Amino acid sequence: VNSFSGYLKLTDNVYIKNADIVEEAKKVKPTVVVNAANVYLKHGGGVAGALNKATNNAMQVESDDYIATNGPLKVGGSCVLSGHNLAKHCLHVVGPNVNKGEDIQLLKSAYENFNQHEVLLAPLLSAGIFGADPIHSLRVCVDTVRTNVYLAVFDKNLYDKLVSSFL
């Protein structure tokens, strides 16, 4: 039993809700919130800009030190950093950016990072400003993630279409 509330069960391990991931994080304080990161951990907009703003820019400050030490992430890769006031940990995951021509096949690799954590609050990777088909992102999630994932989907109209086309 966990404290996630109001989610629709899609499969044995995947759940979904029409909500801002930032608000779900503020309410649940999950062990792991997933950020839809880019390789530079520049948290400007979308999920990343919203999470970072909610941390009063502490996420960005921590991220800049991470990059200065370690260099950029790989597309499809991830790192674990602090969750600040939103969660215990933030798993920064880089899905491919279709607008930059990055290989959508890397979306599966991106979701594989979720399997290192038993329970996660996550957005749809590569959706929104990242330019991929969100229906496809949900399919890859369900077919790749084996741990328990709670998907917060900000856009109401998007949430409605994701549910209806699933089974």
Ligand SMILES: OCC1(Nc2ncnc3[nH]ccc23)CC1
């Ligand atoms: O609409 C779904 C998507 N975006 C978001 N999802 C969850 N929480 C969010 N907070 C800000 C943006 C945002 C993935 C594209």
Ligand SMILES: [Cl-]
């Ligand atoms: Cl977005």
